[PDB]
């Protein structure tokens, strides 16, 4: 599928992804303003060959994914400037849970439904042999009060069939506060590492993405802000000691224990996304 840049009318900027900026455009070939609203992700023109090969990998990944809880790929646009492809995706109207939750008080049952849907989309992703590596409330988009979709595949990687993990690089942009200890210490990302990040995302939802309760805020309160190059080492050490993010206010005790089970230090003790689906369905039913 191909979109022409001459019909793309920029409305506003939506934010910054991993490889570049996301903008909202009206794709209007008739010029009558009745065209579809689309989210367009672009690679910064100044980016090097490392970001360029990774950007092409992200497009390749999103083009192959098709799920009700995964942002819909619409096509690509020939960017004459930057000499690359612009990723055309569906506009998800309510935006990210990070932006939405602080301004709209959502009930516990609805948050658990969002958690269930995240697990459904993540179970499909893992079945396709991919790891997400950036599962956070910031990357979860809300279509309506009852539908959520996973976004930003900028860190997503293919896991070979014979392998259970992918070896990661020492990176400044890594979302360390959403990462399992095996990622921080051994630079290995397992399917089970995405489950750890889900536990963190669930914590975020239960706090209504309150910035004063965010994973960086809480972990840095424990680590301190004057630790030289040792923030990650101190994070690794507290996690190994069994320290964890606290129970969000009004989060049921059993839901917090499910969260802590996503945060097992031993990756094999964590549930898979497939195990989480029937559990979250039952928990959502109890609270609805």
Ligand X SMILES: O=C(Nc1ccnc(NC(=O)C2CC2)c1)c1c(Cl)cccc1Cl
Binding to ligand X in span 219-248, by CB under 6 A? none
| Stretch near ligand X under the rule CB under 6 A, chosen from 3-11, 92-100, 110-118, 221-229 | 92-100
Decide if 205 contacts 255 (C-beta within 8 A): no
In angstroms, the Cα distances linking 101 to 69, 82, 157, 169 are: 18, 35, 29, 32
Burial class (CB in 10 A: 0-12, 13-18, 19+), 260: middle
- Return the range that interacts with ligand X (CB under 6 A); candidates 90-98, 180-188, 190-198, 225-233: 90-98
Near ligand X by CB under 6 A: residue from 22, 26, 159, 277: 22
Shortest CB 99 distance to ligand X, Å: 7
What's the Cα-to-Cα distance from 174 to each of 66, 115, 166, 177, rounded to whole Å? Answer: 26, 23, 15, 9
Over the window 94 to 123, marking each residue x when it contacts ligand X by CB under 6 A and - when it does not, the resulting string is: -x----------------------------
Nearer to ligand X, 139 or 174 (CB): 139
Q: Annotate each residue in 35-74 with x if it binds ligand X (CB under 6 A) or - if it does not, as one string.
A: ----x-----------------------------------
Q: How many other C-beta atoms lie within 10 A of the C-beta of residue 287?
A: 14
* DSSP label at residue 252: -
- Closer by beta carbon to ligand X, 29 or else 93: 93
Q: Does 136 bind ligand X (CB under 6 A)?
A: no
Q: How far apart are CA 213 and CA 110, in angstroms?
A: 20
Distance linking the first and last C-alpha atoms of the chain? 41
Least Å distance between CB 191 and ligand X?
Answer: 21
* Residues in region 152-171 near ligand X by CB under 6 A: 152
- For ligand X, the closer of residues 39 and 123 by Cβ is 39
Q: Which stretch binds ligand X (CB under 6 A): 45-53, 138-146, 215-223, 260-268?
A: 138-146
Shortest distance (Å) from residue 287 CB to ligand X? 27
Number of residues that bind ligand X (CB under 6 A): 16
Q: Should residue 92 be labelled a site residue for ligand X when binding is judged by CB under 6 A?
A: yes
Closest CB to ligand X among 85 and 192?
A: 85
What three-state secondary structure class fits 220?
A: helix
* Candidate list 15, 35, 54, 75; residue touching ligand X; CB under 6 A: 15
Going by C-beta distance under 8 Å and a sequence separation of 6 or more, which residues neighbour residue 235?
176, 177, 184, 219, 223
Contact call for residues 58 and 20 (beta carbons, < 8 A): no
Q: How far is residue 56 from each of residues 43, 49, 148, 245, measured CA to CA in Å? A: 10, 11, 26, 36
Residue at token pair 């964590």: 270
Sign of the dihedral defined by the CA atoms of residues 269, 224, 18, 140, in that order? positive
User: Looking at beta carbons only, is 25 or 190 nearer to ligand X?
Assistant: 25
Chosen residue from 8, 62, 117, 151 binding ligand X by CB under 6 A: 151
According to CB under 6 A, which one of 3, 8, 17, 182 is a site residue for ligand X? Answer: 17
Residues that bind ligand X (CB under 6 A): 14-17, 22, 39, 89, 91-93, 95, 138-139, 141, 151-152
């Amino acid at each position: 599928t191909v979109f022409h840049k001459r019909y793309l009318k920029k409305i506003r900027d939506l934010g910054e992804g991993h490889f570049g900026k996301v903008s909202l455009y009206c794709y209007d070939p008739t010029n009558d303003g009745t065209g579809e609203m689309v989210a367009v992700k672009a690679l910064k023109a100044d980016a090097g060959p490392q970001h360029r090969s990774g950007w092409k990998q992200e497009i390749d990944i999103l083009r192959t994914l098709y799920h009700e809880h995964i942002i819909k790929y619409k096509g690509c646009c020939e960017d004459a400037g930057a000499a690359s492809l612009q990723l055309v995706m569906e506009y998800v109207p309510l935006g990210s849970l990070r932006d939405y939750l602080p301004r709209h008080s959502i009930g516990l049952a609805q948050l658990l439904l969002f958690a269930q849907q995240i697990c459904e989309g993540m179970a499909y992703l893992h079945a396709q042999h991919y790891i997400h590596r950036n599962l956070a409330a910031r990357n979860v988009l809300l279509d309506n009060d009852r539908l959520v979709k996973i976004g930003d595949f900028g860190l997503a990687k293919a896991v070979p069939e014979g392998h259970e993990y992918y070896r990661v690089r020492e990176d400044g942009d890594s979302p360390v506060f959403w990462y399992a200890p095996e990622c921080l210490k051994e630079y290995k990302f397992y399917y089970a590492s995405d489950v750890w990040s889900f536990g963190v995302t669930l914590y975020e939802l239960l706090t209504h993405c309150d910035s004063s309760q965010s994973p960086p805020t809480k972990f840095l309160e424990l680590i301190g802000i004057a630790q030289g190059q040792m923030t990650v080492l101190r994070l690794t050490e507290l996690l190994e000691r069994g320290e964890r993010l606290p129970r969000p206010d009004k989060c049921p005790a059993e839901v917090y224990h499910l969260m802590k089970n996503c945060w097992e230090t031993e990756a094999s003790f964590r549930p898979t996304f497939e195990n989480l689906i029937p559990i979250l369905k039952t928990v959502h039913e109890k609270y609805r």
